[PDB]
Scaffold this active site. Structure first.
Site, mmCIF file in Angstrom:
data_model
loop_
_atom_site.group_PDB
_atom_site.id
_atom_site.type_symbol
_atom_site.label_atom_id
_atom_site.label_comp_id
_atom_site.label_asym_id
_atom_site.label_seq_id
_atom_site.Cartn_x
_atom_site.Cartn_y
_atom_site.Cartn_z
ATOM 1 N N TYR A 184 0.917 -1.179 0.000
ATOM 2 C CA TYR A 184 0.000 0.000 0.000
ATOM 3 C C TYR A 184 0.939 1.208 0.000
ATOM 4 O O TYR A 184 1.814 1.258 0.777
ATOM 5 C CB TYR A 184 -0.985 0.086 1.192
ATOM 6 C CG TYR A 184 -2.444 -0.003 0.801
ATOM 7 C CD1 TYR A 184 -3.013 0.989 0.020
ATOM 8 C CD2 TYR A 184 -3.228 -1.104 1.145
ATOM 9 C CE1 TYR A 184 -4.325 0.900 -0.427
ATOM 10 C CE2 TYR A 184 -4.528 -1.220 0.673
ATOM 11 C CZ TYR A 184 -5.074 -0.232 -0.134
ATOM 12 O OH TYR A 184 -6.339 -0.310 -0.646
ATOM 13 N N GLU A 235 -0.165 4.705 -0.739
ATOM 14 C CA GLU A 235 -0.918 5.991 -0.953
ATOM 15 C C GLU A 235 0.024 7.177 -0.695
ATOM 16 O O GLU A 235 0.830 7.184 0.254
ATOM 17 C CB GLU A 235 -2.155 6.146 -0.053
ATOM 18 C CG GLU A 235 -3.043 4.912 0.019
ATOM 19 C CD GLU A 235 -2.722 4.126 1.281
ATOM 20 O OE1 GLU A 235 -1.482 3.789 1.502
ATOM 21 O OE2 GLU A 235 -3.681 3.913 2.076
ATOM 22 N N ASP A 288 -4.578 13.879 -25.155
ATOM 23 C CA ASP A 288 -4.698 12.537 -24.743
ATOM 24 C C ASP A 288 -4.059 11.684 -25.834
ATOM 25 O O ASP A 288 -4.684 11.423 -26.888
ATOM 26 C CB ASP A 288 -6.179 12.176 -24.594
ATOM 27 C CG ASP A 288 -6.425 10.721 -24.207
ATOM 28 O OD1 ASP A 288 -5.421 9.926 -24.083
ATOM 29 O OD2 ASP A 288 -7.617 10.419 -23.907
ATOM 30 N N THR A 300 -2.159 6.181 -21.918
ATOM 31 C CA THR A 300 -2.011 4.863 -21.443
ATOM 32 C C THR A 300 -0.528 4.496 -21.525
ATOM 33 O O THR A 300 0.231 5.102 -22.276
ATOM 34 C CB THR A 300 -2.860 3.906 -22.280
ATOM 35 O OG1 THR A 300 -2.594 4.111 -23.649
ATOM 36 C CG2 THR A 300 -4.326 4.157 -22.069
ATOM 37 N N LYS A 341 -0.618 0.067 -25.495
ATOM 38 C CA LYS A 341 -0.782 0.565 -26.851
ATOM 39 C C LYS A 341 0.591 0.724 -27.545
ATOM 40 O O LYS A 341 1.424 -0.186 -27.418
ATOM 41 C CB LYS A 341 -1.664 1.817 -26.871
ATOM 42 C CG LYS A 341 -2.998 1.515 -26.179
ATOM 43 C CD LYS A 341 -4.061 2.557 -26.521
ATOM 44 C CE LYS A 341 -5.426 2.246 -25.894
ATOM 45 N NZ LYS A 341 -6.070 3.473 -25.484
ATOM 46 N N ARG A 389 -0.773 -2.352 -18.804
ATOM 47 C CA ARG A 389 -2.049 -1.608 -18.875
ATOM 48 C C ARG A 389 -2.050 -0.627 -17.701
ATOM 49 O O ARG A 389 -1.923 -1.083 -16.569
ATOM 50 C CB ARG A 389 -3.181 -2.624 -18.730
ATOM 51 C CG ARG A 389 -4.378 -2.387 -19.632
ATOM 52 C CD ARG A 389 -5.165 -3.669 -19.804
ATOM 53 N NE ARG A 389 -4.771 -4.349 -21.020
ATOM 54 C CZ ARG A 389 -5.189 -3.995 -22.224
ATOM 55 N NH1 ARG A 389 -6.034 -2.990 -22.354
ATOM 56 N NH2 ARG A 389 -4.761 -4.640 -23.290
#
Lengths: 425, 425
Positions: free
Chosen positions: B55, B57, B201, B227, B230, B236
Site C-alpha cells: 500500500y 498511498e 490525450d 495509457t 498501446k 495496462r
C-alpha cells in the site's frame, strides 16, 4: 529455458534489484497495517501472465471486440466464484480498485450535488465516503455519523436520527477502522425509513464476510463494494456485488463504459484465483485465526495498560489509544517503524489531535497471520510494541525490539521459494 | 525449486489451463486491433512480483504509510524515466488506466456541468472525451469538433470557429481513430484564443511521440495523458504528464486522494521497465517500423480497391471504408474474425450507418510489428483481408485466408520461451 524474470534481470537490472530488495523488506519487518496482506504465489502468477495483452471492453460474451473467448471464460469464472463466495445474484469483477468500485456505484445511483451519509472519516470512514479531498466530498454533499462517545461503537438509534435529519440519498456503511460487527439489517431499516439507497463497502472485512466470520451484507443492502486485496487476500482491485441482478446490469454499464476503459484481465484472473482460494476450508480457518490473533494482540496490549477503542475487536483490526504512553499516533508510528514494525496512525473517536497528528495507532493481524503466526506470537508482538512505546528513549529496549522482530521474521518465512538465501552450510 | 506458476497449476488448474489457451490464442491469430500490443517478458515479470502486496498511498517520500523505501525508489524511477522519455517537468505514474488519468485531470480543472470540447466520437474521439454513456458526457457538457468532409482530416480554422462559438473550458485533442499528425501548436493557439485549458490525450500514439515519430504535445499543452500500453508497449495503466510542475502537483492530489486509493506498485514497476525500453534505440526503430508497416498495409489495401479515410496514414492505424465491398464494419469485422484476424468496426467520418453497424474497419500495425513482421508481410496481410472481404461467401478463399494467417503466425513466434510446443522430432 529463459523465464520472464531472466529477461527482467538481463534488460533492467536496476528494477530487478529493487524488486529483490522489496521482497527482502516484506520478509524482514512485521506488517501490521490492517489493510495489508501477502497474496498467493498463484495470484502473482496470474498477474505476471500474457493476459495483460487483451483489450476486453464490455462483459463476457458482450464485448466491443473479438478475440475474448478465453478472457470471457476467465472473467466468467471470476464472476461465478464471486457470486458463489458472497451468495450474490450479480458480481462485476472489472473495477480497478475499491475507489473505482465505489465511483461506479455513485455514477449509477447519484448525480453531482446529491447527499451521501457515511461514517465520519475520523471515526473510521473512508476517503471515498465523502472526504473533501476526494471526488466523493468534492462533487457530492457528504454528511457523517460517528460512534457513541460512551461505547465507542455504532448506536443505530443515533444513526437513524441523523439520517432522519439529513435525508441522504445514499447511506454508506463499512469502514476502514471500525473494530466491531456491523449490523446490516439495522442499516436496511434505517435506509428504508428515510428512502435512501444502501451501500456496504466491506473492503477491510471482505475475507471475514467470505469465511462466515462476519455477517454478509449482500442479502440486505442494495449494493456491496469491496477490494479484492486486504482480508480477502487477493490481487489489488475492486468488486461490485448486488442481490438485485437488474441493478447489477446498471452497475456493469457504470463500470464500463461509465468509469473505466478496458479491464485488467491478468488481475481479473488473480481475482478468480483468490476467490477460489477463499472457497476452500483453509481460508475459513485462516479467517478464524485472523480474528483470534487480533483479539490476542488487543488483549495483551490491554494487559500492558493500553486502551483499545471500543474495549476490543470482533474483526482483524484494533485502534490503540496512546494516552497511557503520552504519545501522538504520529510519534508512535515512527517509534514502531524504527524497530521494523509497520502500522499507521489513526484518529481515535473524539480525538483532541488533528488528523495529521492523531492519538491512535491502527494495528491488524491479516498479513502476519498469512505468514503462520498464532495467538501467542501476536501476544509477543503486543509486548514488543508496548516495550517500545513505554520506553521510547531507551536504546537497549529499542535493540531488544529489533531482535525480537527479527526472530519472529526468521520463524515465519515469506515466499521461501523466491530468491532463497545462500544455505548456511 | 517451485515457481509461482507451479503453484498456480497445482492449486487452480482451471485458471492455469485457460491462461495457456489465451497464450495460444495470442500466438495463432493476427492481432490488428490498433490499441493492442505484446508487452515484454520483463514487463510481465514486474506485474507478477510481490509489489502487489505494498500500500503506497501518497507520492515517493510523501506517503501516508511507512515501509515504502523500495516502492518509492521504483515509483521514482518510473517518474524519472517518464520525464526523460517525454521531456516533461512532471509525471504521475499512478493512474490505473487512461480513463482514470483523464478523470483526474477533469477533477483538477473542471467542475460538474463545465463544457468540454473534443473530437466527435464518430470521427475518432474517445468515450472519455464526452460520450453520454461515460462520466465525461454524463456530468459535463460535451461538445465536439470533427474532420473536414473534404480532406477527412482536421481543419484547424474550423476547430477555431467551433471553439469561438462554444467557449469550452477544456479542449481535448488526441484520438483513438485519427490517422494523421496532430498539430499541437495550432491547438495551443486555439485554446489561448478562447481561454480554454488544453489536454492532449495521446494514448494511441504515445510510443510514436516517445520515439520522435510524432510531435510531442508536452511543451505546448497544459497537460498530456496517456495509457502505458498501446504503442508505448507497456503494462495496462495510465500516465499524466505536464510541462508545468506546479500544476503537476495539483494533478498528483487529484489522482490521490482525489480519484484513487492505493496505486498498483507492481504495474508501476512495469511502467518503469517499459519507459526504460522506450529510451533505447531498438524502440525507436520499432516505432519507425510500426508506421512503415501501417503505411504498407494501407497502400496495398488501396491497390486492392479500398478507400482509406484521409487517403492514408501518418501513424500506426488506418480506417478502411468498406463501400467498395458493400459491407458494414460489423459484417467485415466478423468476416475477418472468421479467418483468425482481430480488428474492429469503426464509424467513418460522416458515416451513414449507426455506430452499432458502421461503414469502417480500424486496423493497426503495433502488435504484429512487435512480432517482427515487415512491410511485405503487412502487404500480405492487406491481401488476405482484401481476399476475404471481396469474396465473403467463398469457402475456398476463406480457407486460403486461414492458411495464410497460420503461415504468418508460424513465421513470427510470440514469447517462444513460454509453454513451448513439443519438438517435432
Amino acid at each position: 529455458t529463459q523465464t520472464n524474470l531472466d529477461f527482467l534481470l538481463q534488460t533492467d537490472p536496476t528494477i530487478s534489484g529493487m524488486m529483490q530488495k522489496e521482497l527482502q523488506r516484506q520478509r524482514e519487518h512485521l506488517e501490521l497495517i490492517a489493510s495489508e496482506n501477502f497474496t498467493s504465489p498463484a495470484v502473482m502468477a496470474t498477474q505476471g501472465s500474457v493476459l495483460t495483452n487483451k483489450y476486453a471492453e464490455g462483459l463476457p460474451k458482450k464485448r466491443y471486440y473479438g478475440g475474448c473467448e478465453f478472457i470471457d471464460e476467465i472473467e466468467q469464472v471470476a464472476i461465478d466464484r464471486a457470486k458463489e463466495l458472497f451468495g450474490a445474484a450479480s458480481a462485476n469483477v472489472q473495477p480497478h480498485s475499491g475507489a473505482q468500485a465505489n465511483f461506479a456505484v455513485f455514477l449509477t445511483l447519484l448525480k453531482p450535488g446529491d447527499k451521501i451519509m457515511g461514517m465520519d472519516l475520523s471515526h473510521g470512514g473512508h476517503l471515498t465516503h465523502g472526504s473533501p479531498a476526494n471526488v466523493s466530498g468534492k462533487w457530492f454533499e457528504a454528511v457523517h455519523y460517528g460512534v457513541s462517545q460512551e461505547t465507542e461503537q455504532l448506536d443505530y438509534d443515533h444513526i437513524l436520527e441523523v439520517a432522519r435529519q439529513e435525508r441522504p440519498k445514499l447511506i454508506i456503511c463499512g469502514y476502514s477502522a471500525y473494530p466491531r460487527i456491523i449490523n446490516f439489517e439495522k442499516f436496511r431499516a434505517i435506509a428504508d425509513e428515510v428512502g435512501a439507497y444502501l451501500l456496504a463497502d466491506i473492503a477491510h472485512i471482505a475475507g471475514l464476510v467470505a469465511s462466515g466470520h462476519h455477517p454478509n451484507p449482500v442479502p440486505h443492502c442494495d449494493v456491496v463494494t469491496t477490494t479484492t486485496h486486504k482480508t480477502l487476500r487477493g490481487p489489488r482491485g475492486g468488486l461490485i456485488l448486488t442481490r438485485d441482478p437488474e441493478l447489477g446490469k446498471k452497475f456493469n454499464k457504470s463500470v464500463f463504459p461509465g468509469t473505466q476503459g478496458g479491464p485488467l484481465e491478468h488481475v481479473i484472473a488473480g481475482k478468480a484465483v483468490a476467490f477460489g482460494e477463499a472457497l476452500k476450508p483453509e481460508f475459513k480457518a485462516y479467517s478464524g485465526q485472523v480474528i483470534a490473533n487480533a483479539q490476542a494482540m488487543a488483549q495483551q496490549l490491554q494487559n500492558r495498560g493500553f486502551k483499545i477503542v471500543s474495549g476490543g475487536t470482533d474483526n482483524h483490526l484494533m485502534l490503540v489509544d496512546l494516552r497511557s504512553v503520552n504519545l501522538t499516533g504520529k510519534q508512535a508510528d515512527q517509534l514502531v517503524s524504527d524497530v521494523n514494525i509497520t502500522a499507521n496512525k489513526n484518529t481515535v473517536p473524539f480525538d483532541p489531535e488533528s488528523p495529521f497528528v492523531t492519538s491512535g495507532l491502527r494495528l491488524g493481524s491479516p498479513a502476519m497471520t498469512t505468514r503462520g503466526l498464532g495467538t501467542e506470537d501476536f501476544a509477543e508482538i503486543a509486548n514488543i510494541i508496548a516495550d517500545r512505546l513505554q520506553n521510547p528513549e531507551d536504546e537497549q529496549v529499542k535493540q531488544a525490539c529489533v531482535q525480537r522482530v527479527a526472530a519472529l521474521c526468521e520463524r515465519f518465512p515469506l515466499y521461501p521459494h523466491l530468491n532463497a538465501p545462500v544455505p548456511a552450510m
